[PDB]
Amino acid sequence: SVDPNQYYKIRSQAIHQLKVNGEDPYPHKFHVDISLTDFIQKYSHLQPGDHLTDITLKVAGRIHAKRASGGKLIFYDLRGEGVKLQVMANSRNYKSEEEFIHINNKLRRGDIIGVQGNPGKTKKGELSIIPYEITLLSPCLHMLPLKDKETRYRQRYLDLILNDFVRQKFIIRSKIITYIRSFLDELGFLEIETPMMNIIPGGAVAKPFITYHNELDMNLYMRIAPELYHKMLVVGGIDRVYEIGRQFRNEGIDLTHNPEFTTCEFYMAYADYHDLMEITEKMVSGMVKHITGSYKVTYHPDGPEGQAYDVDFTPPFRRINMVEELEKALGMKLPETNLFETEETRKILDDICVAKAVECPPPRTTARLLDKLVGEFLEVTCINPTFICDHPQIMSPLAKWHRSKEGLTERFELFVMKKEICNAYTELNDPMRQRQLFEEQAKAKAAGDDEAMFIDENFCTALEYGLPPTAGWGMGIDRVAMFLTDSNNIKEVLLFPAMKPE
Amino acid sequence: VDPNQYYKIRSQAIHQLKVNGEDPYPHKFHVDISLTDFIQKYSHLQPGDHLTDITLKVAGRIHAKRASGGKLIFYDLRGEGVKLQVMANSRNYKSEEEFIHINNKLRRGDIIGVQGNPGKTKKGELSIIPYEITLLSPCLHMLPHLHFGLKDKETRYRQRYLDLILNDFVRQKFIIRSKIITYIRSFLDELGFLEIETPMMNIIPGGAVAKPFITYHNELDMNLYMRIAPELYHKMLVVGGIDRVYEIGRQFRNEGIDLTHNPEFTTCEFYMAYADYHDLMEITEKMVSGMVKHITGSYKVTYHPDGPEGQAYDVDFTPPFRRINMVEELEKALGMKLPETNLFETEETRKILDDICVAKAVECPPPRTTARLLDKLVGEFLEVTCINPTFICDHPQIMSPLAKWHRSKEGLTERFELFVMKKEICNAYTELNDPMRQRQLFEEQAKAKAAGDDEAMFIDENFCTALEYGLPPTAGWGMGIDRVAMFLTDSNNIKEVLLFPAMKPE
Ligand SMILES: NCCCC[C@H](N)C(=O)NS(=O)(=O)OC[C@H]1O[C@@H](n2cnc3c(N)ncnc32)[C@H](O)[C@@H]1O
Ligand SMILES: NCCCC[C@H](N)C(=O)NS(=O)(=O)OC[C@H]1O[C@@H](n2cnc3c(N)ncnc32)[C@H](O)[C@@H]1O
């Protein structure tokens, strides 16, 4: 048995000699007549022993096995597109005996080859192609083995070659995105692109990446959300806009966070958050039914040997109000919602966290304590899709104030399998109120909150030209893909996930 | 009145409405019908008609406010790219007192809701005759006067929302942008391509010759580069056995702004196993000609290289596209023979090209590499003569370190660029898939980078290891979406087709 580095060195020398001899081991064009998939669909009815001499076809793929059965006969296990096809290299059937001997000497497991041959089926019932001629298209210079998660992510190409289920997760991911586009296109939304480099990042509470433009001699930030730009287009008269695109957040990596991820955001003039709850139910349950075939999905959050959950996407989804549900979950009344700005509320919330052992790193502000208490006591009860509604204004600096509950806003988040999938609200369109909330945010930054929003004057000026009553919405695409591919790790649904180095 | 005085006065008026509970920013106005549907449904009304039995709620932005005595006032209501006249009549309003109150309250630019009955003026103008108008969002700033409009480009580009409010041709350019992207997805989906997303933050940037943006990740404690192209990720997926992939997405290049460059821009890149670049010329001809025809109704498009006040040109997208070879057309344009193409990597050839650029007054800032000198000469002598869609083919290897060597012309590659209306649109080639020859070209590129070439590629060892597992013979393609939007909207400035283009600050 040879050694993988010794093998690489021998196979490199062999391919070099092919070059110096003029054997052209990286040819320019091979014309494929038919895919492997259609070859199987056309010919897998044949009878054992058959050999259709009147049909000549060219296929191509990757050798996954080379098994010899004699001096005149060699079997190649050809793979591609998710399927297999046996090449039955028989000397009698080949272009010549001299050329037959030579091509079989050349080929190894892993090479890309083109086969020109006839359909057939072995005595043992295996569908095959019987070649007149095989062409080496691209030799594989390394030894092919994949279970350990680290190698699959650093070398996704090996993962795709060896693990058929991986291609399917990314087909599902592609179907998610394509469904969303045609859902919103049908509603009249315009698909738009807005800057990913901003003088001032905003649209979310997140830590941004910073970079530098040499010619303009200015710092820029990668966007954390396109929200501010979308609301400026609504001011401009484009009543329905959406964007599926990459966001960037300088935050830690875990099972549901990657530093670059994909969201869909859309904005709808003359709608409120109640309208968006209906659209969300309709879109999300529709997507799940279209992709999986049912409203029910089985999710394994601790891998396959762990506990199974049945998540039920039948609309209408359950709704819970944040502050009232938290009171029921803690067993104690909280301050009146108009007192959430005060230091007494902050300390009251602080004490509750201490008593209930809910950790919260500094700064221990009212908004961050409430977040920690929600995740601990509410979010973990959201197995099926659940709307969590009416967030305190102090957590929602871009959301319009609630119609009848002072201190709250017209906001919702959708949770599925205890994880946040959507964030939405009636948009704050009062520019003076928006400017006050920015000033609060910039104070929360000066007082230790790495993720608090910057003041965006240019955005406040836009609101001064008149933003119609509007409602916007954001969905984390990667996370949806997780829950439709039974992946408990976001790295399963990212082709090349962010990794620590060597 | 002064524009700043107007802003101060209107802010104070609106603030007094809040303090008096007049709610100038109401939560919900339930619209019954869009303006577009209203226009279609009641365009069949006869002149002078006034439906007494149809009451509808619409909304929009007041574009103009014209009084006609104290009992009648017309509002020109805009939205969705269309216009609807509100014929506000005191006799039909909620009351004559409410009529005075709302007309004095409202100004040009306000967002209003309108509840009323369809009608048509004696002059034949489709109207709505309101029972009640509601302010939904006041416009606090004085809008550019209805006379001289909004024409100054600096203002349009910095306040794109203002541009959109006042210039309907702007909305049309971005509708055309959307259709371009949607057509490409349909074309490529139908051919079986899988739409993919590959990383925009890279340990090292690759896939192009460009200067990158650098950034930093705190938790992982490393520098990252914003991507200059997705190319290397795509070719690794073809090694992985996904024979057809594509991606329409942002690229980032830390280079100067001009009429055809923005620091961030959008490309479609696709890779197709078992194809070469001749196959991609046919595909490009079909996609692009079909795109123009489907979107504009014609294969002929009008082109003004010098603005609307100047010469108009008809540009024909009917395939086949003209095909020329780079080196020979360059030699033609110069009137002078360049060195044999197997000599394009020598220093003596770089010297000759440098001498020529000096002589022809083609500027090239340092580093004056063969590729950059060649790129400048092409831009000066060939790009300007590509009006109709044109394939420029068979670039020398030294400009194409990821492109496969030409199967019969030593020193050249199997590459083409599509040029339309004096602009580069596409870049494509048969993909280099010999990993030993790809490492060599990486090494030369690193040497140049040591000698201070901001744009030279890094040695990507992970990519080279990938090629050693076997990349099938493949062909790949990159198209500038912004650049297609330019030529399909007769725009000579890329800022016309980016919603928020990068600008130097105030
Ligand atoms: N005006 C309405 C608000 C719309 C969306 C708002 N601008 C916004 O960005 N909200 S968000 O909640 O911060 O992000 C949207 C979704 O992105 C997802 N998300 C957030 N951070 C990450 C990370 N880091 N990785 C993956 N997915 C993520 C998650 O599902 C969120 O619900
Ligand atoms: N293997 C095939 C190569 C495919 C494309 C290759 N990876 C690449 O990046 N080529 S490129 O020419 O550098 O860019 C592709 C297109 O992007 C467009 N482009 C390039 N720079 C800019 C800038 N700065 N702004 C706008 N558009 C731009 C232009 O249409 C180019 O043809």
Cα A378 to Cα A308, B59, B138, B166, B292, distances in angstroms? 20, 39, 39, 47, 53
Q: Are B86 and B128 in contact (CB under 8 A)?
A: yes
**Sheet holding B390-393: strands in order across?**
B194-195, B244-252, B264-273, B474-480, B423-430, B415-420, B390-393, B322-325
Cα of B251 from ligand 2 centre, angstroms: 9
Cα of B484 from ligand 2 centre, angstroms: 12
Cα separation of B392 and B412, whole Å?
A: 13
Q: What angle do CA A437, A440, A443 make, to 5 degrees?
A: 150
Q: What are phi and psi of A271, to 5 degrees?
A: -110, 155
Could you tell me where the DSSP H helices lie in B123-273?
Answer: 153-158, 160-166, 168-190, 231-239
Count the neighbouring beta carbons within 10 Å of the beta carbon of residue A312.
15
Closest C-alpha among B123, B37, B44 to residue B82: B37
Q: Which residues of B touch A269 (CB under 8 A)?
A: 59
* Range A147-499: architecture per CATH: 2-Layer Sandwich (3.30)
Domain locations in chain A as residue ranges: 4-146, 147-499
**Owner of token pair 């009008």:** B302
**Chain B, window 288-317: residues with a beta carbon less than 8 angstroms from a chain A beta carbon:** none
Phi-psi category of residue B34: left, alpha or beta, with phi > 0 → left and psi -120 to 50 → alpha: beta
Cα A38 to Cα A21, A178, B271, B395, distances in angstroms? 36, 25, 21, 37
Cα separation of A455 and A144, whole Å?
A: 54
Q: Are B60 and B76 in contact (CB under 8 A)?
A: no
Q: Are A411 and A425 in contact (CB under 8 A)?
A: yes
Count the neighbouring beta carbons within 10 Å of the beta carbon of residue B167.
15
Q: What angle do CA A140, A146, A150 make, to 5 degrees?
A: 105
Domain B151-503 in this protein, CATH class: alpha beta
Cα of A261 from ligand 1 centre, angstroms: 9
Cis amide linkage into residue B367, ω under 30° from 0: yes
Collect all residues with Cβ–Cβ distance below 8 Å to A428 and sequence separation of at least 6.
Answer: A397, A398, A399, A400, A401, A434, A437
Query: Which of A233, A426, A501 minimises the CB distance to B203?
Result: A501
| Residue of chain A with shortest Cα separation from B59 | A270
**Owner of token pair 């040997």:** A305
Phi-psi category of residue B21: left, alpha or beta, with phi > 0 → left and psi -120 to 50 → alpha: left
Query: Which residue lies with its CA nearest to atom 24 of ligand 1?
Result: A257
Q: Are A26 and B486 in contact (CB under 8 A)?
A: no
- Evaluate: CB of A289 within 6 angstroms of ligand 1: no
Beta strands in A323-438 (DSSP E): 386-389, 411-416, 419-426
Q: What angle do CA B499, B504, B506 make, to 5 degrees?
A: 105
Q: Are A46 and A55 in contact (CB under 8 A)?
A: no
Q: Is A250 annotated as a binding residue?
A: yes
Count the neighbouring beta carbons within 10 Å of the beta carbon of residue B176.
17
Closest C-alpha among B446, B469, B470, B472 to residue B458: B446
Query: Which of B213, B499, B505 minimises the CB distance to A192?
Result: B499
**Owner of token pair 């190319």:** B231
Closest C-alpha among B220, B288, B286, B228 to residue B254: B228
Q: Are B29 and A270 in contact (CB under 8 A)?
A: yes
Query: Which residue lies with its CA nearest to atom 12 of ligand 2?
Result: B427
Q: Which two tokens stand for residue A224?
A: 């954390």
B28/A contact by beta carbon, under 8 A: yes
Query: Which of A161, A229, A410 minimises the CB distance to B241?
Result: A161
- Evaluate: CB of B478 within 6 angstroms of ligand 2: yes
Q: What angle do CA A427, A182, B185 make, to 5 degrees?
A: 120
Cα separation of B12 and B50, whole Å?
A: 39
Cα separation of B254 and B357, whole Å?
A: 25
Cα separation of B348 and B338, whole Å?
A: 11
Q: A412: which strand partners?
A: A389, A424
Q: A248: which strand partners?
A: A260
Q: A423: which strand partners?
A: A413, A474
Three-state SS annotation for A291-354: HHCCCEEEECCCCCCCCCEEEECCCCCEEEEHHHHHHHHHCCCCCCHHHCCCHHHHHHHHHHHH
B17/A contact by beta carbon, under 8 A: no
| Residue of chain A with shortest Cα separation from B433 | A26
Work out whether the CA dihedral B49, B50, B56, B61 comes out positive or negative: positive
Q: Which residues of A touch B465 (CB under 8 A)?
A: 142
Q: Which of B173, B186, B232, B239 should one mutate to test binding to chain A, selecting the residue with the greatest count of A CBs within 10 A? A: B239
Q: Using CA atoms in the order A156, A157, A161, A163, what is the torsion angle rounded to 10 degrees? A: 0
Q: Are A269 and A205 in contact (CB under 8 A)?
A: no
Residues A1-33 as b or e (16 or more Cβ within 10 Å = b): eeeeeeebeebbeebeebeeeeeebbebbbebe
Cα B156 to Cα A222, A230, A468, B163, distances in angstroms? 24, 17, 21, 5
A236/B472 touch (CB, cutoff 8 Å), yes or no:
no
A468/B137 touch (CB, cutoff 8 Å), yes or no:
yes
Closest C-alpha among A412, A424, A423, A419 to residue A482: A419
Burial (CB < 10 A; 0-12, 13-18, 19+), residue A132, is middle
Q: Is A249 annotated as a binding residue?
A: yes
Cα separation of B415 and B432, whole Å?
A: 11
Q: Are A115 and A95 in contact (CB under 8 A)?
A: no
Burial (CB < 10 A; 0-12, 13-18, 19+), residue A154, is middle
Closest C-alpha among A229, A228, A230 to residue A184: A230
Count the neighbouring beta carbons within 10 Å of the beta carbon of residue B1.
8
Query: Which residue lies with its CA nearest to atom 20 of ligand 1?
Result: A476
Q: Which two tokens stand for residue B418?
A: 């599509």
A13/B contact by beta carbon, under 8 A: no
3-state secondary structure of A174: helix
Cα separation of B118 and B325, whole Å?
A: 63
Closest C-alpha among B242, B265, B244 to residue B254: B265
Closest C-alpha among A188, A259, A269 to residue A230: A269
Count the neighbouring beta carbons within 10 Å of the beta carbon of residue A57.
18
Q: Which two tokens stand for residue B289?
A: 């000609």
Decide yes or no: CATH 2.40.50.140 for domain A4-146. Answer: yes
DSSP A214-280: TTTTEEEEE-S-SHHHHHHHHHTT--EEEEEEEEE-----BTTB-SEEEEEEEEEET--HHHHHHHH
Q: How far is A34 from chain B (nearest CA, A)?
A: 11
Q: B128: which strand partners?
A: B86, B118
A496/B contact by beta carbon, under 8 A: yes
Cα separation of A132 and B282, whole Å?
A: 30
The length of chain A is 502
Q: Are B433 and B484 in contact (CB under 8 A)?
A: no
Q: Which two tokens stand for residue B329?
A: 């057309």
Cα separation of B329 and B143, whole Å?
A: 52
Work out whether the CA dihedral B438, B439, B445, B448 comes out positive or negative: negative
**Chain B, window 396-415: residues with a beta carbon less than 8 angstroms from a chain A beta carbon:** 404, 407, 414
The 8-class DSSP code of residue A397 comes to T
Q: Which residues of A touch B165 (CB under 8 A)?
A: 235-237, 465
Residues A224-258 as b or e (16 or more Cβ within 10 Å = b): bbbbbbbbbbbbbbbbbbbbbbbbbbbbebeebbb
A102/B contact by beta carbon, under 8 A: no
Cα separation of B446 and B453, whole Å?
A: 9
After which residues do gaps appear in chain A, with C to N over 2.5 Å?
Answer: 145
Cα separation of B40 and B38, whole Å?
A: 6
Decide if B3-150 and B151-503 have a common fold. Answer: no
A113/B contact by beta carbon, under 8 A: no
Q: How far is B432 from chain A (nearest CA, A)?
A: 9
Q: Which residues of B touch A60 (CB under 8 A)?
A: 274, 472
Q: Which two tokens stand for residue B89?
A: 């009549």
**Owner of token pair 């090209």:** B353
Q: Which two tokens stand for residue A370?
A: 């409430």
Query: What angle separates helix B168-190 from helix B277-296, to the nearest 10 degrees?
Result: 140
B194/A174 touch (CB, cutoff 8 Å), yes or no:
yes
Cα separation of A463 and A435, whole Å?
A: 10
Q: Are B120 and B126 in contact (CB under 8 A)?
A: yes
* Cα B490 → chain centroid: 12
B469/A110 touch (CB, cutoff 8 Å), yes or no:
yes
DSSP B406-448: PSSSTTBBSEEEEEETTEEEEEEEEBP--HHHHHHHHHHHHHH
Cα separation of B144 and B416, whole Å?
A: 47
End-to-end CA distance of chain B: 25
Strand pairing report for A386-389 and A318-321:
parallel
Q: How far is A300 from chain B (nearest CA, A)?
A: 25
Q: Are B316 and B390 in contact (CB under 8 A)?
A: no
- Evaluate: CB of A478 within 6 angstroms of ligand 1: yes
Closest C-alpha among B111, B115, B110 to residue B30: B115
Q: Are B201 and A259 in contact (CB under 8 A)?
A: yes
Closest C-alpha among B295, B299, B260, B315 to residue B184: B295
Q: What are phi and psi of A486, to 5 degrees?
A: 40, 60
Q: What is the resolution of this structure in A?
A: 2.5
**Sheet holding A210-213: strands in order across?**
A197-198, A218-222, A210-213
Collect all residues with Cβ–Cβ distance below 8 Å to B353 and sequence separation of at least 6.
Answer: B338, B370, B373, B374, B377
Q: Are A284 and A313 in contact (CB under 8 A)?
A: yes
Cα separation of B134 and B30, whole Å?
A: 11
Q: Which residues of B touch A496 (CB under 8 A)?
A: 198-199, 233
Closest C-alpha among A293, A294, A300 to residue A312: A294
Residues B435-455 as b or e (16 or more Cβ within 10 Å = b): bebbbebbeebeebbeeebeb
Strand pairing report for B82-89 and B126-137:
parallel
**Owner of token pair 């700033």:** B141
Q: Determine which helix (DSSP H) or strand (DSSP E) holds A160, and give its type and residue range.
A: helix A156-162
B3-150, CATH topology level: OB fold (Dihydrolipoamide Acetyltransferase, E2P) (2.40.50)
